[PDB]
Amino acid sequence: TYKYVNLREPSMDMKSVTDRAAQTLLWTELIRGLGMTLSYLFREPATINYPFEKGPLSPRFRGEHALRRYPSGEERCIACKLCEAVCPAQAITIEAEPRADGSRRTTRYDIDMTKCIYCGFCQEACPVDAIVEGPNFEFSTETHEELLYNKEKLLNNGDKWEAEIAANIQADYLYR
Amino acid sequence: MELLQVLKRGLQQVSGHGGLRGYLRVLFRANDVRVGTLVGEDKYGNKYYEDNKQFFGRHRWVIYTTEMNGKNTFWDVDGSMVPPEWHRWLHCMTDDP
Amino acid sequence: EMVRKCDPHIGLLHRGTEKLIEYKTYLQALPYFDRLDYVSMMCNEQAYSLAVEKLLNIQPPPRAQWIRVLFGEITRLLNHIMAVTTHALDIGAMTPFFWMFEEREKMFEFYERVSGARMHAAYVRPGGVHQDLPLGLMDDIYEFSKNFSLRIDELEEMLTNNRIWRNRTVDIGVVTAEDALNYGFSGVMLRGSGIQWDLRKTQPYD
Amino acid sequence: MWFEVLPGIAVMGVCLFIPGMATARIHRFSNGGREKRVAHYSYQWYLMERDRRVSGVNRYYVSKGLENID
Amino acid sequence: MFMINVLTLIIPILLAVAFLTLVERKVLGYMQFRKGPNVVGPYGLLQPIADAIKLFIKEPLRPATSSISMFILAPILALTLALTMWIPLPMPYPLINMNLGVLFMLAMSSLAVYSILWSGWASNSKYALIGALRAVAQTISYEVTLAIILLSVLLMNGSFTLSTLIITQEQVWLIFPAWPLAMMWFISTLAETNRAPFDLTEGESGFNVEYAAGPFALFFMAEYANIIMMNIFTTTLFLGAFHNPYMPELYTINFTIKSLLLSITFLWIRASYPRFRYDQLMHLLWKNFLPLTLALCMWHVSLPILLSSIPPQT
Amino acid sequence: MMTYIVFILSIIFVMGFVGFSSKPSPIYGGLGLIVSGGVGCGIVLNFGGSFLGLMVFLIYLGGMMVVFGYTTAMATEQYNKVVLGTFITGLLMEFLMVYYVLKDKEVEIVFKFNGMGDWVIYDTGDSGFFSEEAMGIAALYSYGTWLVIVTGWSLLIGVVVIMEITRGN
Amino acid sequence: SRGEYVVAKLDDLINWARRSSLWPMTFGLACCAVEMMHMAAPRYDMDRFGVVFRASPRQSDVMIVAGTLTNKMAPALRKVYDQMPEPRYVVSMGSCANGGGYYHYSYSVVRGCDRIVPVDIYVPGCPPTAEALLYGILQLQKKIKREKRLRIWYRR
Amino acid sequence: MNLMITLLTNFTLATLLVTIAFWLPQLNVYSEKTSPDPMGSARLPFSMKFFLVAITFLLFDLEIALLLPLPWASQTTNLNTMLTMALLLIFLLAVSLAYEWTQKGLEWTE
Ligand code: SF4
Ligand code: SF4
Ligand code: SF4
């Protein structure tokens, strides 16, 4: 159950000694390395042409946060504050009040994307699938405050990406 | 001989883009001149192509439009220039365009 | 050119991880173990989840035990590629550094498919795993693992029999068996010096 | 595909090929359709100066042949 | 009409070293399964132009110069010794024909270490001075072994003139009866240019760490000019091609081809071997290269007398 | 002006010596004497001595004053009036002798010296198919037996001296 | 007029020259440095963009802060940024260099590398994917592409 | 004079390059670097092996210059004396190398 690596006794005969001398003088293993490099020169490189080509990703991909909606126009979140309680980085701040029709809805849903570690605890703790770690990843910003999302930016992200977040969650929800 | 087949493949690469003008256009705008089956296009003008013989990662690609939301994007292409319905197919979420 | 005293200074990356655990719950402290050793990301959670399950007096289901070993062993291919190739990068042979990174990019897709993140998966949890493997994942593992035996022989060809690699390596860094045990060494340190000690054979887990 | 670095090799080739052809053409044009008369020893230089004196032009590459004598 | 020839020699040198950088970049890319620059233009043709214009508008590093005059003089001397040294190469006729052209190149290659010494002296950091001293010691020793090898080569040739060496290599190449000298010259051309696997100018601190980016670019162009010079010198003197006195461009094309494959071999070797140590290559010359080189010199100075093959002086 | 080129270089040669005559610092003195060695080798080369000039370049400049710079780099840690005064004194003496040899064309310091250009003492003869100094150097291995013997013995003894007196014990 | 058109042409020429050869200085601190090295893999291949790999910090044009910037490292990072010649750009990898991220409330973690150096491009993630940093680098190239140094110099 | 013309042209082109690299970027108004190495305050150590190998290089180069004129000398009439002299000189080089080997010269910088 244990093997002795680097415990091979070299042969002391004239054949192996002369072959090792020829390896030392003629650089035979160096020639082998040259041949390997030549063989690996002619292969087709694996360089994908970004941004005209994109890398392979899964439907479970964790990216930009978004707030979803029901298929009737009403926002999915009910201000239950599970995501801000489960968040390991405390990037989610929720302030709520009963609105005009008496529904329990959020008034402030802030996600600090510079604080968030993209762990996906909010997308699994949410009992109504309101917050989703969406598929977007190309949202690098030039200014720090543009990464401090309020409720309106998250709702705009949800309205923008719902046409693919719904398909992803439809393809994925049977594993959850 | 064998090199005749490679030369004919290069000639069909040149002639498949609607001539030498289109060949140099896609060469200077995308740095890749290989041909493929036109999967489709969106409203903004981005064309989407598939070539299953290539290795994984390079089999699906997109040629971007020259104008999207009023921006002259002849040279300035962006990774976020893809609508979500094509963002599924491009990043290999699913096999159905 | 020679050395009698070499005093390293550490603390340039002191985040204070083990204090922040005290103010968070057990499930909230799980992503902290991902970021301790960021080339053995999926192996550290197996150590943390084994600690919680020992206290909780529960055991994972039999399917979860085989997944943690399978993805634990794929992380050994993650880490040891970083071990040899960056050691070759520091010495000077930059050629196999880019050869194995395409392979390391291929097993990054396996991390992204089952959990959703390339590096910090937060997959292994106390009590099992968070999600099951997607359908057809293990078919993609076998087709990759069939062709991976050539890459190790590809890497071994340019380094093991190279006389330049040997002359930098064969007589620098020699320990004895007794002082390795007294220095708190483990892993390849004890195995390299000839001491027969492996935790997977003497005190096994799942 | 291995046939993509060869434009750089061809640019290297034309860059290393231009100065030799240029100096060969300049040598052939300047020396009257002939090579440059090298002078590694003083006897060759003395014959060079003899040619320059004999030619009557103070340019040796307009050489005078058999027709110059009677 | 001479200054036109001088300009057509010195401007393609700069173009050739810029395309050395570009070709080396895509070759090291393709050697290691990745790709080189291909975004800027067609197959990355406009990359060296971007490199030059970037390096000609940047800010300097602002070092505490102990000697401003020496700091100015070091890159001028480096570029001069790299650029004016290309003259006596016979392709197929040299720009300036010397009877002692090989001695001329050898003397200026021996004195080329003054740029490294002045770069070490201009920087007030003592570790840079230590690295400069180590590089100078390596270069002067390796110039010793170059001097012995070249002495053997032109005593085989018998005359110091570089143009007669083409006539010497007409029937057979010099690599056939001087193959061990060929291998020692190949290690010497690999090693004299401060190149991997003996590149101690990068591993542990360069000899121009406090120098500005402009002088650093000048040093790099000078080093690459020396690389192409000695590659072409090896091509001419060990692999002499057929030269028709009426049809010269076949010889120009032929030695251009050998120069290009020898430069490709340089980029090949630099991408296959890990770096050595200082004492390792000092041991390589002072205990392994020097006695074999001396024995080869003894054998090659004893051979033509016993073979009735003493070559002509003229 | 051109025909006195060696003389002009000779003037620069004297200037080069002044460039390290005051000796303000060993590194600047080494640089000035490097420049003086270059112009003195140009003086040698303009007389037809290519081999001796490249002996000066290869050995004196590129192989030995490199060692001088290497040694002086081991001391003289990085960071005068009478230096500058001696510089102006040497400048005044140099220029005064320049006007002396450019106006009188004759001077007396130790012997009678002429100021006329040196292009009158060369030779119009031909050595044939060989440089005279080339086979002059080449005659060392056929005639100079005792000189080569003592040169090799002295250089080996210098190696002995370097091994012994720098051992320190 | 002639002058504005000429300085515009020269501005876009030097702008293309600067944006096509961005030489970086990688700060190998933490996880995001390993993600940068995997962006340097043959699949993503930064080197086709004119971006060399692992340049010296005395000649680099851009700096990518990848990892956690603690209190013990901030003077060293400020010294490195001050040593790097003009023009200099800073790209922030990860949540650590953006706002601290996981360790925002730790006692010995600087809450964002913006407090030490000016930061141009913020790349979000933990770690951000390799193609996300590639898009951020292209965004930095486009930010350089619209610079107006010579036009402002002529107008002033 | 053509050689000196080439040397002057090359040196002036190098001067133009260093003038572009030194004074052309001074038009920009970027910043002034106040800027307030492993060498803390200790004096530079005198590593004697470097000086020893430098003077060994000097002696070997000097007698290499002695060894030089063999290609010109090979046409001499007295070939036996030349052969004896050249073999004995290279033997002297071998003997000096052997002595530099024996008396601890090639150790700690091999
Ligand atoms: S992914 Fe994790 S760290 Fe980010 S907001 Fe959700 S719970 Fe918080
Ligand atoms: S867990 Fe879901 S429903 Fe509850 S507060 Fe968060 S987003 Fe709203
Ligand atoms: S942002 Fe996340 S992945 Fe990047 S260094 Fe910080 S903990 Fe690691």
mmCIF file of all heavy atoms in Angstrom, chain E residues 248-261:
data_model
loop_
_atom_site.group_PDB
_atom_site.id
_atom_site.type_symbol
_atom_site.label_atom_id
_atom_site.label_comp_id
_atom_site.label_asym_id
_atom_site.label_seq_id
_atom_site.Cartn_x
_atom_site.Cartn_y
_atom_site.Cartn_z
ATOM 1 N N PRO E 248 23.770 37.101 -56.497
ATOM 2 C CA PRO E 248 24.011 37.164 -55.045
ATOM 3 C C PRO E 248 22.776 36.942 -54.178
ATOM 4 O O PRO E 248 22.876 36.536 -53.007
ATOM 5 C CB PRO E 248 24.557 38.587 -54.851
ATOM 6 C CG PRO E 248 24.737 39.165 -56.249
ATOM 7 C CD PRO E 248 23.761 38.440 -57.101
ATOM 8 N N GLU E 249 21.600 37.232 -54.738
ATOM 9 C CA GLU E 249 20.383 37.190 -53.941
ATOM 10 C C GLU E 249 19.993 35.778 -53.528
ATOM 11 O O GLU E 249 19.260 35.627 -52.547
ATOM 12 C CB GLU E 249 19.229 37.865 -54.683
ATOM 13 C CG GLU E 249 19.070 37.447 -56.119
ATOM 14 C CD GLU E 249 19.420 38.560 -57.083
ATOM 15 O OE1 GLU E 249 20.482 39.192 -56.904
ATOM 16 O OE2 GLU E 249 18.630 38.805 -58.017
ATOM 17 N N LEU E 250 20.483 34.740 -54.219
ATOM 18 C CA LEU E 250 20.276 33.388 -53.707
ATOM 19 C C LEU E 250 21.026 33.181 -52.395
ATOM 20 O O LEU E 250 20.489 32.574 -51.463
ATOM 21 C CB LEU E 250 20.680 32.326 -54.737
ATOM 22 C CG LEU E 250 21.967 32.308 -55.567
ATOM 23 C CD1 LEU E 250 23.158 31.770 -54.798
ATOM 24 C CD2 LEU E 250 21.731 31.442 -56.790
ATOM 25 N N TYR E 251 22.249 33.708 -52.293
ATOM 26 C CA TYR E 251 22.981 33.629 -51.032
ATOM 27 C C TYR E 251 22.310 34.465 -49.953
ATOM 28 O O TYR E 251 22.269 34.058 -48.784
ATOM 29 C CB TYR E 251 24.428 34.078 -51.219
ATOM 30 C CG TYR E 251 25.154 34.269 -49.908
ATOM 31 C CD1 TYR E 251 25.429 33.187 -49.081
ATOM 32 C CD2 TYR E 251 25.551 35.531 -49.491
ATOM 33 C CE1 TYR E 251 26.086 33.357 -47.878
ATOM 34 C CE2 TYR E 251 26.210 35.712 -48.292
ATOM 35 C CZ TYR E 251 26.474 34.621 -47.490
ATOM 36 O OH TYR E 251 27.129 34.798 -46.295
ATOM 37 N N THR E 252 21.791 35.639 -50.327
ATOM 38 C CA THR E 252 21.096 36.479 -49.352
ATOM 39 C C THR E 252 19.846 35.783 -48.813
ATOM 40 O O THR E 252 19.612 35.748 -47.599
ATOM 41 C CB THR E 252 20.735 37.821 -49.989
ATOM 42 O OG1 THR E 252 21.876 38.341 -50.681
ATOM 43 C CG2 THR E 252 20.324 38.814 -48.917
ATOM 44 N N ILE E 253 19.061 35.176 -49.706
ATOM 45 C CA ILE E 253 17.870 34.434 -49.302
ATOM 46 C C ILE E 253 18.249 33.228 -48.449
ATOM 47 O O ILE E 253 17.599 32.935 -47.437
ATOM 48 C CB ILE E 253 17.068 34.032 -50.556
ATOM 49 C CG1 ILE E 253 16.188 35.196 -51.018
ATOM 50 C CG2 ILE E 253 16.226 32.788 -50.316
ATOM 51 C CD1 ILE E 253 15.794 35.132 -52.477
ATOM 52 N N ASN E 254 19.327 32.535 -48.822
ATOM 53 C CA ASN E 254 19.712 31.310 -48.135
ATOM 54 C C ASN E 254 20.190 31.595 -46.713
ATOM 55 O O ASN E 254 19.766 30.926 -45.756
ATOM 56 C CB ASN E 254 20.793 30.594 -48.943
ATOM 57 C CG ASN E 254 20.823 29.109 -48.683
ATOM 58 O OD1 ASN E 254 20.193 28.628 -47.744
ATOM 59 N ND2 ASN E 254 21.563 28.371 -49.503
ATOM 60 N N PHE E 255 21.055 32.602 -46.539
ATOM 61 C CA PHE E 255 21.500 32.871 -45.178
ATOM 62 C C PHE E 255 20.423 33.579 -44.366
ATOM 63 O O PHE E 255 20.426 33.453 -43.140
ATOM 64 C CB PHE E 255 22.809 33.676 -45.133
ATOM 65 C CG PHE E 255 22.624 35.153 -44.918
ATOM 66 C CD1 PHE E 255 22.922 35.718 -43.686
ATOM 67 C CD2 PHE E 255 22.143 35.970 -45.921
ATOM 68 C CE1 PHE E 255 22.747 37.070 -43.467
ATOM 69 C CE2 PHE E 255 21.963 37.324 -45.709
ATOM 70 C CZ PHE E 255 22.262 37.872 -44.478
ATOM 71 N N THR E 256 19.487 34.286 -45.019
ATOM 72 C CA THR E 256 18.312 34.783 -44.306
ATOM 73 C C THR E 256 17.474 33.629 -43.769
ATOM 74 O O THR E 256 16.993 33.681 -42.630
ATOM 75 C CB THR E 256 17.482 35.682 -45.229
ATOM 76 O OG1 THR E 256 18.274 36.800 -45.649
ATOM 77 C CG2 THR E 256 16.241 36.206 -44.520
ATOM 78 N N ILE E 257 17.315 32.566 -44.567
ATOM 79 C CA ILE E 257 16.564 31.388 -44.129
ATOM 80 C C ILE E 257 17.246 30.729 -42.933
ATOM 81 O O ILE E 257 16.599 30.421 -41.922
ATOM 82 C CB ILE E 257 16.390 30.402 -45.300
ATOM 83 C CG1 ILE E 257 15.312 30.899 -46.264
ATOM 84 C CG2 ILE E 257 16.031 29.013 -44.806
ATOM 85 C CD1 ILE E 257 15.100 30.003 -47.480
ATOM 86 N N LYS E 258 18.566 30.527 -43.020
ATOM 87 C CA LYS E 258 19.273 29.932 -41.883
ATOM 88 C C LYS E 258 19.231 30.828 -40.650
ATOM 89 O O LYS E 258 19.100 30.330 -39.529
ATOM 90 C CB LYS E 258 20.720 29.579 -42.231
ATOM 91 C CG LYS E 258 20.883 28.288 -43.008
ATOM 92 C CD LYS E 258 22.224 28.226 -43.713
ATOM 93 C CE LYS E 258 22.148 28.784 -45.108
ATOM 94 N NZ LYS E 258 21.514 27.777 -45.987
ATOM 95 N N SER E 259 19.320 32.147 -40.833
ATOM 96 C CA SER E 259 19.204 33.055 -39.698
ATOM 97 C C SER E 259 17.828 32.969 -39.050
ATOM 98 O O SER E 259 17.717 32.988 -37.818
ATOM 99 C CB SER E 259 19.499 34.483 -40.148
ATOM 100 O OG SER E 259 18.727 35.421 -39.422
ATOM 101 N N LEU E 260 16.769 32.865 -39.859
ATOM 102 C CA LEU E 260 15.421 32.787 -39.302
ATOM 103 C C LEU E 260 15.197 31.486 -38.537
ATOM 104 O O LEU E 260 14.651 31.508 -37.428
ATOM 105 C CB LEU E 260 14.378 32.952 -40.407
ATOM 106 C CG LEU E 260 14.209 34.353 -41.004
ATOM 107 C CD1 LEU E 260 12.843 34.497 -41.652
ATOM 108 C CD2 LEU E 260 14.434 35.450 -39.966
ATOM 109 N N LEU E 261 15.618 30.344 -39.096
ATOM 110 C CA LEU E 261 15.494 29.102 -38.325
ATOM 111 C C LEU E 261 16.421 29.053 -37.110
ATOM 112 O O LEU E 261 16.064 28.431 -36.106
ATOM 113 C CB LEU E 261 15.674 27.854 -39.199
ATOM 114 C CG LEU E 261 14.552 27.440 -40.174
ATOM 115 C CD1 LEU E 261 13.216 27.484 -39.443
ATOM 116 C CD2 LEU E 261 14.434 28.205 -41.470
#
